[PDB]
């Protein structure tokens, strides 16, 4: 199950590079140098890697000690074969951002922050970036009175407008995907859920600008079903990338490598991009714990690839199966993606057999037979066929 | 704090109709009859009742029945003087409904749900009704194989699609609400969220005749922030009708009386509709503990109203105080009401004071003063000003 | 993977028995006679079944209905050799029980409750059980004035110590199991962890009686970690029985067969179970969900069986893998099973070496190798190695 | 409501002392130090503070830098006023504590940890500590293989014995708290509630010598009752010490000030504490969002004490309220009071009114009166009686 960079993995530079930092605890790693990781990504097989501006530049940076940061990066980038598909910016680590980036209560705040994104954008395109990542991680609030919602999201719609007005202005080949988290750091963060994002999305003045980016963890902090809202988002054609990791459950965010945490929403997950043919760079956004050293820094990261491999294959099987295809026939999946009335209103009004002479009692005796299809699936994920 | 009609309070007939059954338990309440109910509600200052169409007329009546059902809904309304501002189909409780109704995989079952719910449409137009509710309660499921999501939402916007097509035709004032809930009674409901159920909208022919009826214990089931999600749904005009009770928490749906559960979560919710100015009706969608008898059934209903007009007096008074006001300021609640760049794009990117020349430190230093806000808020929630 | 009685599957009665009714729907099955399932559990591969008294015997029955009852159960225990090893009492579903039953506010219902209890421990004792479980699902409360929780744990103790009276007066070799649950039925309920129950379990006046039962979903409704809770019950000595199903989070009580739900923590608790050689009965206690017919049913609990069967034969292998043995070894297992200080307290308060002349950078610098060993966990458990 | 010392309002140093260093961010606020927070704690009326060993005397401090903290603290606490009624030890920051403290697979660290503990008994001995707290935040894991979970209890209770030990061997008065929280920093930590503590104590040595601290915001991470949890811990006389905060929901762990969070369970917290007669300490561990500056630190303090004031005097009026104390007859609390059975087994198994004779169906029709009761707590609470 080895990777090799036709299959579109990439990894952000503070996923192997995080220290170990926790609000409990300091730091139990050195720091990486953004070069080296990305020599040691290439050799495991990723096709490329990520970054904030700040991972990339030290903030405050003068413009001289920026260009010889980008210098190094771009050498590495060559003598690698690896690409920069996505890029993004940190709106949250810096004290100033402590009330949020675009939505701060401070108007001089909401302006830096803006004029901070539109320097990044310039990079991102410069290095080949194709989707402009947006995670506003301190918009939000741990009170009530704190921030007015209303007057927050007209903030953040008047900040992305700018941001296509931008790129539209320049001729940039490159679009935004909003990553939603429902909390963490902020004790409620605005644009929560997949869904929250995807109606936001629908008022701006350029929809077709922007999408999402919707990762795993993040989802599953609400309870919620991330296959589900993947294929929302999918349904919507609104899926531009993905942040892909691992979560148990309700509970702060914690970053686990791909595969772990919920190992069926992974598969379910897995079969899904497979079949809609997602053909965006599959993303790791996740933490080697900081129990680990570099060793297992490493070993983590090719965890995340070899997860989804295997679980790629696992599902390719699942749907090649005969006896499969005809579970999911017994289920009427096939009924299922077939219009409920294409013979239209009239017809349906008209009809006796949808309503007067309908067996209500016949149908609702029909199994669905779903138990034994799950059990296939679970047959297949375990290679116990 | 006593309600009048004027309040806009409503209730569903399943409400304090619910005889107690619970899925490890038996009635513990004998059934009501709809008139009796419209009477009770009346006299505690109620303004209107709901109904699906199976609490107002049994499930398989007779045309004849029906009629008759209806003659005696229509006396006791008009002997009370209550309306019927919202009316709901069930689409949940008969077997056949076991894998959906708008989304079953059994197409003739789609068909059946949407001959049902037309069926109720004119009745509820009628009676009365300006919104018309759908709960998909069994559009989901409990294992990933059961259903594709993407079909299922094509055949979710196909039903919805051929309602508008329906009231159009027919010339009715009546608008759609969806009403979003992210689990319970299947593993995993479709539009879990307010955000999800405003995206698919978007999506719709015509989008202006559907909005949301958010419910405070859905939202709260995913861990969401309610108030925050009903802000967003004011944002975006789609607040047609909503749906008051109480939630402790992430657990199975509680529909306790409205004010218990979270109690500052209701606060600020209370503050939210009043001040946005919303027109529609209060609706309790609640259940009276299996504990109670009638007695307790009718001081639960009470209970409602009295926690919403205490609500309304403490968050006024909140937003009245010159204390409140310059802490609002102090906090730069005014400053996040004003644009970030009306300016516009070019003038911000050469402006200096924005970036070059801003000085990170001296506003990372300003203090938010977001903990005396909340104290205030939290002194007018309590009475001790 | 084909079970036979020797792997010691056992079912509720009320678990294949389920007619589908949930709070928002009809029964979608037909009731099953308690003789059939034995027939058809037998026939699966299962050892033995369960029961309430009120699955076995109709609440109400005559003394000559109930002796019927049971003789037809009694053969057909015999006809396929079936054993009972746990039985236990309704206290939940009859309203009298709507505020519990052995910490009911109405000291009438204790009583009857104690009552309706004891003349089900000579049933189960007749029958061969081993285990007499109690659930307490109505004990708790919606509100917070409505139960004084040290007046209920009174009751709660004194309930259980004239049980264990009752028990050592007649000569019984039957002992209790608690069963814990978070919530639902009630808001809270009552020794809501197995940790609570242990605790409790210590107060009464022959704790050597009693014991726990816990139940996956149950624990996973409060967000917890299962095999944990399993190794705490383990390391008190007093996990008497085991309760196996399938729960996705916090959520409503969803009762999925076994393997179902958080798949990972089905691996580790089967690792746990079979390397500390619990030898008790693996009872399910599941629901077929109410989209299944009879064959979905029947397919369900033999899947149950099945994914036990898998997950033992890859903890198995896990466990045996020299490489996983050395991988154990590397991340210092084996020294977390050595004592710290067994040299003694003033040893150690002289040993230089433990503080003085510590090289806490030098510890701390060691990693601990956690991932490559989860993902050697990983790789067994999807049979990728 | 202004507090006074006689309230034993206290706060740990590293409360209002905490810089805003969260996962996603830096510092907002400089370090404070613990003379000038001494100093503006007893201006604000606390009776006291604790600490962390590391809290006082930075980490790796010779011998003569610690005597000059200690001698400046002293000076600062005579200067005051102010008690140091709860110690306790840092084993989580260092890196060294990454695996854990107590029950870290590496041998070396465990003696580690003892040591670095008993230094700091002696420590809270000399200040006048009356309860030494253990929070074993690093003790559990993040996979499964990774710590055996019945090694590192015998491991817990070694390194417990061994104090317990120390302590009665220096003829200490103080005794230990252990203090439980589900998650975070580790993906899942031993004895994760309450309930768990408390079974675990009882296999210790000396049981009487341990008690639990429990915290608000902890058992709300497991969305578990906390007035139930404390009114258990209450009945096994173990809550030696207390520590209050605020908490929305299941997430990450927040510390909101004490008040904010779950407002009616603060109530029911109060009520219980109040009327049970607890005498110990009201310890805050709460942080002042990073959103403040030191002024905000100040008002989130006070408003800690302010809030358990206000709940105070509702829980006392609500209590002395003759329409209340009928309302709790009505419910039959005075009921659930009495003995179940006092009159012993055999005269209730001979007593045919508790069953032969016992009339289910009319004691099922009466009501509980729970929602009367509850909505007077809930107009006792809001000051609308």
Same mark, same amino acid.
């Given at each position: 199950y080895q990777p090799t960079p036709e299959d579109r993995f990439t990894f952000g530079l503070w996923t192997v590079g995080w220290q170990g930092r926790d609000p409990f605890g300091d730091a139990t790693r050195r720091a990486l140098d953004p070069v080296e990781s990305v020599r040691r990504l290439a050799e495991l097989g990723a096709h490329g890697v990520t970054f904030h501006d700040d991972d990339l530049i030290p903030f405050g940076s003068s413009d001289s000690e920026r260009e010889e940061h980008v210098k190094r990066f771009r050498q590495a980038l060559d003598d690698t074969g690896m690409k920069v598909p996505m890029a993004t910016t940190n709106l949250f680590t810096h004290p100033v951002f402590k009330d949020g980036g675009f939505t701060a209560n401070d108007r001089d705040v909401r302006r830096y922050a803006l004029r901070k994104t539109i320097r990044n954008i310039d990079l991102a395109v410069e290095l080949g970036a194709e989707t402009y990542v947006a995670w506003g991680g301190r918009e939000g609030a741990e009170s009530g009175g704190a921030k007015d919602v209303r007057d927050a999201l007209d903030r953040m719609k008047e900040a992305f407008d700018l941001l296509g007005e931008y790129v539209t202005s320049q001729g940039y080949d490159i679009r935004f995907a909003i990553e939603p988290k429902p909390n963490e750091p902020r004790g409620d963060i605005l644009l929560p859920t997949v869904?929250?994002?995807?109606?936001? +999305?629908?008022?701006?003045?350029?929809?077709?600008? @922007?999408?999402?980016?919707?990762?795993? &963890?993040?989802?599953?902090?609400? &309870?919620?079903?991330?296959?589900?809202?993947?294929?929302?988002?999918?349904?919507?054609?609104?899926? /531009?990338? +993905?942040?892909?990791?691992?979560?148990? &459950? +309700?509970? @702060?965010?914690?970053?686990?490598?791909?595969? #772990?945490?919920?190992?069926?929403?992974?598969?379910?997950?897995?079969?899904?991009?497979?079949?809609?043919?997602?053909? &965006?760079?599959?993303?790791?956004? /996740?933490?080697?714990?900081?129990?680990?050293?570099?060793?297992?820094?490493?070993?983590?990261? #090719?965890?995340?690839?070899?997860? @989804?491999? +295997?679980?790629?294959?696992?599902?390719?099987?699942?749907?090649?199966?005969?006896?499969?295809?005809?579970?999911?026939?017994?289920?009427?999946?096939?009924?299922?993606?077939?219009?409920?009335?294409?013979?239209?209103?009239?017809?349906?009004?008209?009809?006796?057999?949808?309503?007067?002479?309908?067996?209500?009692? #016949?149908?609702?005796?029909?199994?669905?037979?779903?138990?034994?299809?799950?059990?296939?699936?679970?047959?297949?994920?375990?290679?116990?066929?």
């Open positions: 869904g929250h994002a995807l109606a936001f +999305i629908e008022r701006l003045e350029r929809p077709e600008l @922007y999408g999402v980016n919707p990762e795993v &963890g993040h989802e599953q902090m609400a &309870g919620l079903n991330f296959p589900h809202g993947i294929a929302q988002a999918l349904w919507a054609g609104k899926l /531009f990338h +993905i942040d892909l990791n691992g979560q148990n &459950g +309700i509970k @702060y965010d914690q970053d686990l490598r791909f595969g #772990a945490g919920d190992l069926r929403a992974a598969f379910w997950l897995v079969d899904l991009l497979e079949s809609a043919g997602y053909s &965006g760079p599959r993303h790791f956004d /996740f933490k080697p714990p900081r129990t680990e050293d570099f060793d297992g820094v490493w070993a983590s990261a #090719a965890g995340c690839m070899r997860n @989804y491999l +295997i679980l790629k294959e696992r599902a390719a099987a699942f749907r090649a199966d005969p006896e499969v295809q005809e579970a999911l026939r017994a289920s009427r999946l096939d009924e299922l993606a077939r219009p409920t009335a294409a013979d239209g209103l009239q017809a349906l009004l008209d009809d006796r057999s949808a309503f007067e002479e309908f067996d209500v009692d #016949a149908a609702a005796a029909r199994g669905m037979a779903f138990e034994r299809l799950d059990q296939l699936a679970m047959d297949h994920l375990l290679g116990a066929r």
